[PDB]
Structure 1
Amino acid sequence: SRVCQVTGKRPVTGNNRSHALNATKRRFLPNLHSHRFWVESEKRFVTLRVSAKGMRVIDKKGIDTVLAELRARGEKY
C-alpha cells in the first residue's frame, strides 16, 4: 500500500472546502516515489518506496543509519 518505508507516512483523510465551506470527505496521500538508493557498505542499489519528506531525512541521517532503524521495524529488502 501507499506507505513510506522511511517515515511511515500513510494516506490521511480530510475535507474539500469551498467558498461556502461545504465539506466533502477526501484523502491526502504522501508524495511517494520509488528510488534506488546506493548503499556503500554493500556496494549495491536497494530500491525503497519513500516520500519526498523521507528523501530529505536520508541525506541528513545517512543511508546506513536510516536502514538500521528500518531493520528494527523488520522488513524485506
Structure 2
Amino acid sequence: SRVCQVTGKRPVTGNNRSHALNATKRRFLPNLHSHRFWVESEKRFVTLRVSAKGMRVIDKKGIDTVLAELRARGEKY
C-alpha cells in the first residue's frame, strides 16, 4: 500500500496528454521511503514508511508529535 504513514499521501490517477493531446490514464504516486527514525523519547528506532515531505513534516512538527498522531489515529508504528 504505497501510502505515506505521516501525511496520508496515496497514489492518484491522471492522464498523459501527448503533443496530439492524447489521454492515457495513469498514476502519479508518492515519493515514499520508509525511514528509520530515532526517538529517544522511547530509546528505540521506530521505522515509519514515509514520503519525502512526510519527512519534512517530521523535521518540523517533531517525531514525538507525528507519532503522537497515528497512535491517536489508530495506526501501528
**TM-score under structure 2 length normalisation:** 0.94
Which one has the bigger helix percentage?
A: 1
Q: What is the alpha-carbon distance in structure 2 between the residues aligned to residue 14 and residue 20 of structure 1?
A: 17
Higher alpha-carbon deviation: 67-76 or 6-15: 67-76
Give the structure 2 partner of residue 64 of structure 1: 64
Report the RMSD for the aligned CA atoms in angstroms.
Answer: 0.8
**TM-score under structure 1 length normalisation:** 0.94
Structure 1 residue 43: Cα displacement: 1.1
- Kindly tell me the number of residue pairs found equivalent between the two proteins: 77
Q: Structure 1 stretches (4+) deviating beyond 2 angstroms?
A: none
Higher alpha-carbon deviation: 6-15 or 63-72: 63-72
Percent identity among equivalent residues? 100
What's the CA shift string for 1:6-53, capped at 9, x where partnerless?
001001000011111101000111000010000111111111110011
Say if 2:70 and 2:76, in contact at 8 Å, map to a contact too: no
Where structure 2 has 5 or more consecutive residues not aligned to the other structure, the ranges are none
